Amino acid sequence: TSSVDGASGAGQLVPEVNASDPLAMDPVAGSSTAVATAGQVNPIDPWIINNFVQAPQGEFTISPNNTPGDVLFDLSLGPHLNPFLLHLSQMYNGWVGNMRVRIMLAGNAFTAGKIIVSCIPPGFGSHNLTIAQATLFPHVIADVRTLDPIEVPLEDVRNVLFHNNDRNQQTMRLVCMLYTPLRTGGGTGDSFVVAGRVMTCPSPDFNFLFLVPPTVEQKTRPFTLPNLPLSSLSNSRAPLPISSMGISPDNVQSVQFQNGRCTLDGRLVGTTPVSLSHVAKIRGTSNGTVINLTELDGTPFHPFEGPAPIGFPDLGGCDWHINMTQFGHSSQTQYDVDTTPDTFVPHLGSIQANGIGSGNYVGVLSWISPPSHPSGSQVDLWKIPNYGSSITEATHLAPSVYPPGFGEVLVFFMSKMPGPGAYNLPCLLPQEYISHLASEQAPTVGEAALLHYVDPDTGRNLGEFKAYPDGFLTCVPNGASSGPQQLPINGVFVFVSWVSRFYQLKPVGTA
Amino acid sequence: DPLAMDPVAGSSTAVATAGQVNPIDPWIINNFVQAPQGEFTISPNNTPGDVLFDLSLGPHLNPFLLHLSQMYNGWVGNMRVRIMLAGNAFTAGKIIVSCIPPGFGSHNLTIAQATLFPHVIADVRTLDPIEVPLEDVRNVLFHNNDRNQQTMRLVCMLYTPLRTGGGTGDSFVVAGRVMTCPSPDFNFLFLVPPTVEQKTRPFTLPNLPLSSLSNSRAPLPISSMGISPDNVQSVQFQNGRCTLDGRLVGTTPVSLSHVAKIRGTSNGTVINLTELDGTPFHPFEGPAPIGFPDLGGCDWHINMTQFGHSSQTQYDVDTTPDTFVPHLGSIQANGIGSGNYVGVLSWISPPSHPSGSQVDLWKIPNYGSSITEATHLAPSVYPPGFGEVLVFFMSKMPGPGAYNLPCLLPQEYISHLASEQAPTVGEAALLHYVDPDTGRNLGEFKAYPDGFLTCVPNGASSGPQQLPINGVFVFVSWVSRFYQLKPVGTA
Amino acid sequence: DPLAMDPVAGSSTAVATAGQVNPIDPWIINNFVQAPQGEFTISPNNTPGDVLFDLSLGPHLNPFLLHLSQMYNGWVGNMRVRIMLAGNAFTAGKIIVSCIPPGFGSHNLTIAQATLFPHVIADVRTLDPIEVPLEDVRNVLFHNNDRNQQTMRLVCMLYTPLRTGGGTGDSFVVAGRVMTCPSPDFNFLFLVPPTVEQKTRPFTLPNLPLSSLSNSRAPLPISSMGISPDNVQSVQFQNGRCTLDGRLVGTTPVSLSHVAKIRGTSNGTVINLTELDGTPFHPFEGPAPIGFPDLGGCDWHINMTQFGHSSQTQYDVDTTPDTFVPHLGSIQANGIGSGNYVGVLSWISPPSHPSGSQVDLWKIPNYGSSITEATHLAPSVYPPGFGEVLVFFMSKMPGPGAYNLPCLLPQEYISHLASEQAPTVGEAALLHYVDPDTGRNLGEFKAYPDGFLTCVPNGASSGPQQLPINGVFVFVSWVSRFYQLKPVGTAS
User: Fold this and answer.
1) C73 contacts in B (CB within 8 Å)?
2) Which residue does chain C place closest to A439, by CA atoms?
3) Which among C28, C215, C303 has the least Cβ separation from residue A323?
4) Which residue in C264, C268, C265, C227 sits closest to C394, CA to CA?
5) Is CATH 2.60.40.2660 the right assignment for the domain spanning C1-201?
6) Where is this region: Protruding domain (chain A)?
7) B54 in Cβ contact with B477 (< 8 Å)
8) Cβ contacts (< 8 Å) between A214 and chain C: which residues?
9) CATH classification of C259-349, choosing from 3.40.50.10540, 3.40.50.1000, 2.40.30.120, 3.40.50.2020?
10) Could you tell me the sign of the dihedral formed by the alpha carbons of B209, B210, B216, B219, in that order?
């Protein structure tokens, strides 16, 4: 067999088979409407047809922190629901046919709660539904204690004869919300979560359509991460190696960094470059008192393309000062920069020169110090510098990030910084991750990415993290002083599944 | 929902081209016995993706078949695996068992990737045992007694985590047992004179207590077991080096009468070193003559005698200058007369030259820094795995202070491994530390094919030092990289 | 005429002992698509008996089958090969394609001995392709995804010398193409998780423009491409070397945060060097600590800073004298104080010791003359083809002069190759330099499995210096070592 439920040792404390009315819908045809006017009709391997296999959106959680109405999962019809079909869809141009979904939900006999799954046709639109409106569609209601998995079909309601791997299509969705709140009985410990699984298989009427060169179309590319250990990577706000992982203090809950910001589909945001040869570097013409900044190759910087030139340093709460060299000249100059005054305006393309002679210089940041002007303060590296407070231009800063989930905090990659104290510089992503994501622009299918921190030689799992489409990681700390600082740095992040925003993580560390 | 595999043929494909086909005792066939690693535990601290166990196909799974394999030179056929879990009606959780074909490779997997093999998903409240076939997916007509053979393997991982109700505690674990039997298409192939083919020699250890054995770097009794300090993570010794196959590395002899002994011709300024039997030593075989003392940051000074003269001369040795070149076979002669002397190590001291430093026996001495010859030193060892540490056998050395000499393997173990030349099967050998009277298990260790032991300490000060020294090491099984040792010590 | 071979059975042999048998799509079966080893050349520089191409049977001879083999771990079956040549009426010559069975061994064959196999003889003047079947002569029941095992080979040789008449211009190359399709009895074996086995990964390069990448010998942005001076025909760089399989050689790190950096403790006289994390450097694992700078013919002086201290010092290094022994982990400390420091290269000057020479950045620095320990330098490279020269990626270096620093590969290429460890199927990689917004091909280059690039320049004044730097390198084909490239640049 392939599936053994524990009904022989369950004890008749749970329901075993879901009793429900069938879906109020008609059956939809498959590939037979495509035989006439499509170019080819391509069959799939018969070993893929009848084996249910964990979907790339395969895991979900039900918690007592969920309120009724929260979306547990949300699938769209297509070849990206099956991993074998996702590999095969890179070779083809379009598809028809239905799918078969199985939902696995086998909680404890001391639990209570119910879910509802609805089918929504194309053409309805993007709306946020209640649990009352979810009953106005064809729907199933299930209990969280059921021993057998629930099977739902996903039908291909169509205005046309077939589909293409493009943006000109909208298909049928399966939305699963929480219908009644999850409650437990007995002497419960509140590490209790119902863990649910989703498996899929194609129907026998599914087919692929037209053979194409198998890497070219960008829609069918799957999301990957580079297979490199963390100690061999670098910071994305300064050219420094990664030494640790960590959390911000409790008063800091949001972050608005400008360097090192890339979405999961591969868009660079802010003043973010592609390589480390541009990180924390300035290039400019010194007039004697004012340095006019350009791009690092010499192109004129326009004030509408960003808050600063690409690669401009964004260390906020410090007195950072750089090392300037010169093409065609034999010297090395130190350049002291204070961020606070009225003469520091990088969005208008001009900064100070407090002892830099006239000429054309290129500088890189070397080390930092506590800021001398405001109060005799300390180094606060969670802050961002003051750019140009403009009136005629729209300053296009990157937005702030904050953790969305239950008890989640942001995870930072820390690097040791030279200067007169013990300074740690945080970043949201390594730079090699940014280069991999910008090169491989896979579309994000879902609200978050579940990742595992894994020791590569043994295979042991050290932690469990969530990645978000804006390009940042969150986790749940285990206690008051526990967290990801206790993990070794020779590990590799491994992509596991596409999850929702309200997915709950197991906490990392020892309390 | 059947498994996504086809039936594999058994011994019928060997009837044409093997010489004989040999049947097995019918009391062995449909009889389930426990696997050599048929024990695992699910706790509520385990996460999905944690490898629970791993098995590979072959006659090493059954002890009757492993005894019978040393009488033949080939085998074919399938096996049957049976898994048993001990749970309640008040638990929840799931496991998955996948079938992985030969030629795939060693790669870590997720549970999503685990569902892409032929597999069984099972609940922890299952009352009946779970039955899996183990089929001989192969490229040839039959197997021979080799270890280049790659067979079909089973991996079992955790699918959904363990949740219990009621009086929720952390000490509730689910225990799991693995049993195996051979299928009626299993067969042995050709009758061979037994215990002659070296490919079927089983790995064994001598059945003697640890207190009655000896150090392999000096002729001293073993006193304790211990671990190195945290500043010492890599070690490079030259005596007491032997693989599990039985090959000596470095300057290692087979007998204790050659250990920490020199023999040399003295003219008054240099002592020209030979072998102890009288044959001249040549620099191209090794870093020193076989049996030379390999104590490092130390002023080790020896006792010299000779054949035919009533004499005991004390000889002082200094390994710092360029006068000390044992790689070219000529060392200091700082006051010994002319002739031929044999010397044994007797007494060590703190070193004289750098600062009058402390005795540190974790180091290797300076041998001859040559350019023209080959510096064939035995390489370093370092602990493999996650959280494992090297284990040393420690003896007491005479001198002015409390000196503990560490050792990698005892000399009687080296002689047993050199006499019984058995091949190593896989990555490490699991060992138990047993009381010889009660048979009670005291610890759990790993032996690696380069000839050392690792363990996992329980506390910041716990480990194999808290164990008695009258125990015996006992071989259990061959394990893979997925196996985690239980921590040893009283913590 | 048919070939002198019997029909070979397919997966009928594999039914009993394989776990599954999987069919493939019938639209792939009789569809002749260009192979990934699908390009070759014939030139008057070739002699009769030269190997034009060499193929082994398996799923990697077809791009659809190469994509599909990432979901399986075995195969069995036959294939069909088709060969096209593009010649003139002026070109005289014959080629021969021979089928060689597994277990024969490596021998130097004559053309007469090449006709003693099952073979096809073709004329270069033909306008029609030629058809050859490649059978699965097996000793076993099926195969796994492992190219170490021997299958049947197709070997193409030049049978008669290529001769041209009339106005002989030596740049008339005959182009040749190879196309493949599986037979109807080809089958895959066992469904497996996709793209997990590293033995079936195809070789790619990152889709990034060249001006956005960085140098491999110093942390500097790439500004141009170039060729070496004519007196320099070989180079021996130590930073920025990676096998196309993804192996790092020399003192090459994975990321740019380690490039041209030192770390060590000074006693006032000697700086003892350690690794950049703090672990001790051992003299046997390399020539130097990983990331040590390797700029040969100059006086490079670096910027040093300190953890927990508020200063910045300039450290002047001369790589000439006896104190500069980085292989034993010691350098001089002629003007800096005691303590632990971390330094990075910032600025170079002409070398001071020999007579007042000039900067020569084609040199590598004198690592210490240690014969007791073995100095494990990376080997030298040279162009192996007909009139090829090495290609370098060049960056501007600050100092008293117009200094350009060359390297063999960009650093992001090294990171991509070290992550994606694709096996090298063949002897050289034919690449194209493509204008990304128009799609127009700009040049044609060769990449070798020890990690360097070659081109053929169009004259004494031409080369890849006339090409723009916002292009992308795209992998095109696996070619042999004697593929003749088209000259790049405009004519002199």
Assistant:
1) 101, 103-104
2) C207
3) C303
4) C227
5) no
6) 218-511
7) no
8) 63-64, 67
9) 2.40.30.120
10) negative
Residues 31-70 of B with CB under 8 A from A: 44, 47-51
What's the CA gap between B104 and B98, in Å, rounded?
13
| Residues β-bridged to residue B395 | B222, B405
Instruction: Kindly report the backbone phi and psi dihedral angles of residue C389, in degrees, each rounded to the nearest multiple of 5, phi listed first.
Output: -130, 160
Contacts of C453 (CB under 8 A, 6+ apart): C390, C391, C408, C409, C431, C445, C446, C447
Q: Where are the domains of chain B?
A: 1-201, 202-258+350-491, 259-349
- The distance of B375 to chain C (nearest Cα, Å) reads 9
Resolution in angstroms for this experimental structure? 2.6
User: CA–CA separation, A341 vs A374, rounded Å?
Assistant: 10
Topology of domain A222-278+370-511, CATH: Nucleoplasmin-like/VP (viral coat and capsid proteins) (2.40.510)
What tokens appear for A397 in the block? 């800063």
Q: Is C110 exposed, middle or buried (CB count within 10 Å of its CB: 0-12, 13-18, 19+)?
A: exposed
**Chain B residues touching C18 at Cβ < 8 A:** 6, 137
Q: Which amino acid is at A419?
A: G
Which residue in chain B has the smallest CA separation from C145? B103
What angle (nearest 5°) sits at the alpha carbon of residue C220, between those of residues C216 and C221? 100
- B vs C: CB pairs below 8 A: 65
Q: Chain A residues with CB inside 8 Å of B164's CB?
A: 108
- State the burial class of residue C322 (Cβ atoms within 10 Å of its Cβ: 0-12, 13-18, 19+): exposed
Fold of A21-221: Jelly Rolls (2.60.120)
Write out A125-156 in H/E/C secondary structure: CCCCCCCCHHHHCCEEEEECCCCCCEEEEECC
Structure tokens at C146: 């492992």
- Secondary-structure breakdown of chain B: helix, strand, coil percentages, each rounded to the nearest 5: 10, 35, 60
In CATH terms, the fold of domain A279-369 is Elongation Factor Tu (Ef-tu); domain 3 (2.40.30)
* Closest chain A residue to C31, measured at CA: A211
User: A299 Cβ partners below 8 Å, 6+ apart?
Assistant: none
Question: Using CB atoms, which chains have 3+ pairs under 8 A with C?
Answer: A, B
Q: How many whole angstroms from its chain centre is CA C49?
A: 26
Helix (H, G, I), strand (E, B), or coil: what is residue A32? Answer: helix
Q: What is the rounded distance in angstroms from the CA atom of residue B88 to the CA atom of residue B483?
A: 27
The number of angstroms, rounded, from the C-alpha of A189 to the middle of its chain's C-alpha atoms is 31
User: Chain B neighbours among A 404-423 (CB < 8 Å)?
Assistant: none
Tokens of C344: 């990075």
The β-bridge partners of C33 are C180
Tokens describing residue A20: 């429900």
Could you report how far apart the first and last alpha carbons of chain C are, in Å?
Answer: 50
Q: Are B474 and B431 in contact (CB under 8 A)?
A: yes
User: Which residue is it, tokens 């400019």?
Assistant: A284
- CA–CA distance from A398 to each of A247, A268, A339, A408, A471 (Å)? 21, 10, 19, 22, 12
Chain C, residues 274-333, CB within 8 A of chain A, namely 276-277, 303, 305-310, 312, 314
Coil, strand or helix: which one is C345?
Answer: strand
Neighbour-count burial of A173, counting CB atoms closer than 10 A to its CB (0-12 exposed, 13-18 middle, 19+ buried)? middle
CA angle A15-A20-A25, nearest 5°?
150
Amino acid at B229: P
At which residue do the structure tokens 């990690």 appear? Answer: C451
